[PDB]
């Protein structure tokens, strides 16, 4: 998503459903490639030690001064009628500059944003409807005009404008936890394996304390640890080396 071709609008975003994988969130904060890296509620270093059920990456492009409006508890036209954030938003909002990638010569006016709607949208709800509602008491009933405002408007993405109007690729990371088992977790940082020493061990399946040494036991390929007659961890299999 960071190296994608081109993002969509702020109301018709391509929600990439992330599942059945692992992702290091602490390496993205120190990657020195993002212009804005600020999470809300949950630290990105704590995301590697926590699992989530479904992860949604809402990718859209806004202007330079609109990065403060993509936050829980803020106002704005894009925050109410385009991308509604909940009051308990525990995700993360990242951004980086894309003025030399998404802009065009003379101005990229393909990105749209909704100005108004009949009602406020739900949090994490995508609406691609283009219904036109009148402003005054006289409806236009189709073709706009005579006090009939168009709900959309073209974004102005020029290569020579100020920093507040440059295109900025913003990917909002949505996190949730339900009764379903989790699919997205963080990668456990591995260390060197030391044998023939009274030290601790912490594998992917079970941890404990004891000296690990080679023997003649052979485990099944779908097992990671074992128990004796007294129900005590007496033998373990290394996850990296078989």
């Amino acid at each position: 998503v960071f190296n994608a071709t081109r993002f969509a609008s702020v109301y018709a975003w391509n929600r990439k459903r992330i599942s059945n994988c692992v992702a290091d969130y602490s390496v993205l904060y120190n990657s020195a490639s993002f212009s804005t890296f600020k999470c809300y509620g949950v630290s990105p270093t704590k995301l590697n030690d926590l699992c989530f059920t479904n992860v949604y990456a809402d990718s859209f492009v806004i202007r330079g001064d609109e990065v403060r409006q993509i936050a829980p508890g803020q106002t704005g036209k894009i925050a109410d009628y385009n991308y509604k954030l909940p009051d308990d938003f525990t995700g993360c909002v990242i951004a980086w500059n894309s003025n030399n990638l998404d802009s065009k010569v003379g101005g990229n006016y393909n990105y749209l944003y909704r100005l108004f709607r009949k009602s406020n949208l739900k949090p994490f709800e995508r609406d691609i409807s283009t219904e036109i509602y009148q402003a005054g008491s006289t409806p236009c009933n189709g073709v706009e005009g005579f006090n009939c405002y168009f709900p959309l408007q073209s974004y102005g993405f020029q290569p020579t404008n100020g920093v507040g109007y440059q295109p900025y690729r913003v990917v909002v990371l949505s996190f949730e936890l339900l009764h379903a088992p989790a699919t997205v977790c963080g990668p456990k940082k591995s260390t060197n394996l030391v044998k023939n020493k009274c030290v601790n061990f912490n594998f992917n399946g079970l941890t404990g304390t004891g000296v690990l040494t080679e023997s003649n036991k052979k485990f099944l390929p779908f097992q990671q640890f074992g128990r004796d007659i007294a129900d005590t961890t007496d033998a373990v299999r290394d996850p990296q080396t078989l």
Partner: antibody
Amino acid sequence: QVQLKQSGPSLVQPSQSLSITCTVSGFSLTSYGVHWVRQSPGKGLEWLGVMWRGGNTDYNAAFMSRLSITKDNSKSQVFFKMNSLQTDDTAIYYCAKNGGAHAMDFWGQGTSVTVSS
Amino acid sequence: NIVLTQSPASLAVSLGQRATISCRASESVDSYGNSFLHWYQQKPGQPPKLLIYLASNLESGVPARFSGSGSRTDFTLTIDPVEADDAATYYCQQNNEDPFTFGSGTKLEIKR
């Protein structure tokens, strides 16, 4: 990316008819409405009318009975048909790109229209 | 007919200060959540351009020095700070009621 130039009128006689052609290029004409104004006809900025998005037409109070707007979606050009031209219609006409809440965001170059006996 | 009384006719604001241009409207109000108008800036040797729509958002092509607010009837344009490229006339356009005409024109002059 926004081309709203005008050409065609050079010198018009009074009590005649001539249509001003504003060539629309660079963007979709069927998604916006071309406006029409004048540049300093004695007073400051004056507004004439607004072409809808392929529908009806709206005009000013002093410019409805004599002026008419014709939108051609095939040739990507918006015509401004003028009827009963007098000496008071000597101004520089402009075409504008429609915004979201009926705004005039982008502008064109236009041409100089001079009507005199 | 909507008579957009624009006051004053001229101003003398130096560099680094804030200019105040008023605009009075009557009809109409209460579009969807606001009742504001549009602002424009017309140079004597250049076609005009849109500065800020509905007095609460931003518009590309112009710097972010143009802002403002107002009530349902009176409107205020805020030019802060005034640079060396603001010596032009200003207008306000009605958007809630036909005719969608402009104002009289406030000729802003840079006090040098």
